[PDB]
Curated annotation (Swiss-Prot), chains A, B:
Purpose: Binds to actin filaments in muscle and non-muscle cells. Plays a central role, in association with the troponin complex, in the calcium dependent regulation of vertebrate striated muscle contraction. Smooth muscle contraction is regulated by interaction with caldesmon. In non-muscle cells is implicated in stabilizing cytoskeleton actin filaments.
Protein name: Tropomyosin alpha-1 chain
Tissue specificity note: Detected in primary breast cancer tissues but undetectable in normal breast tissues in Sudanese patients. Isoform 1 is expressed in adult and fetal skeletal muscle and cardiac tissues, with higher expression levels in the cardiac tissues. Isoform 10 is expressed in adult and fetal cardiac tissues, but not in skeletal muscle.
Subunit structure: Homodimer. Heterodimer of an alpha (TPM1, TPM3 or TPM4) and a beta (TPM2) chain. Interacts with HRG (via the HRR domain); the interaction contributes to the antiangiogenic properties of the histidine/proline-rich region (HRR) of HRG. Interacts (via N-terminus) with LMOD2 (via N-terminus) and TMOD1 (via N-terminus).
Region of interest: Disordered: 2-29
Recorded name of the encoding gene: TPM1
Domain topic, free-text comment: The molecule is in a coiled coil structure that is formed by 2 polypeptide chains. The sequence exhibits a prominent seven-residues periodicity.
Subcellular location: Cytoplasm, Cytoskeleton
Domain of life: Eukaryota
Modified positions (N-acetylmethionine) in chain numbering: 2
Ranges of compositional bias, category Basic and acidic residues: 13-29
Record's disease association: Cardiomyopathy, familial hypertrophic, 3: A hereditary heart disorder characterized by ventricular hypertrophy, which is usually asymmetric and often involves the interventricular septum. The symptoms include dyspnea, syncope, collapse, palpitations, and chest pain. They can be readily provoked by exercise. The disorder has inter- and intrafamilial variability ranging from benign to malignant forms with high risk of cardiac failure and sudden cardiac death. Cardiomyopathy, dilated, 1Y: A disorder characterized by ventricular dilation and impaired systolic function, resulting in congestive heart failure and arrhythmia. Patients are at risk of premature death.
Family: Belongs to the tropomyosin family.
Length: 47, 47
């Protein structure tokens, strides 16, 4: 009924928010990892 | 009410899926980057 579908919509919003947080965290980690790869590339040298 | 609710849940689901896609692809890139960090750290001698 109404209450069940309203709850399912609630849980989907939470699922979306969590997925977006997950994406943002991964993209932030990516930023740092790009820096770290660049740092180590400079130590090893050109290639 | 219930008809509009189902329609909203559809948009939320598209939203959730798009974010999950962003997350999975950011984490895939991170896996790649972490493997490169490991390879380069081994060459250099870093922890």
């Amino acid at each position: 009924g109404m209450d069940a579908i309203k709850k399912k919509m609630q849980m989907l919003k939470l699922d979306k928010e969590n997925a977006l947080d997950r994406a943002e965290q991964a993209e932030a980690d990516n930023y740092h990892l790009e820096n770290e790869v660049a740092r180590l590339k400079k130590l090893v040298g050109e290639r």
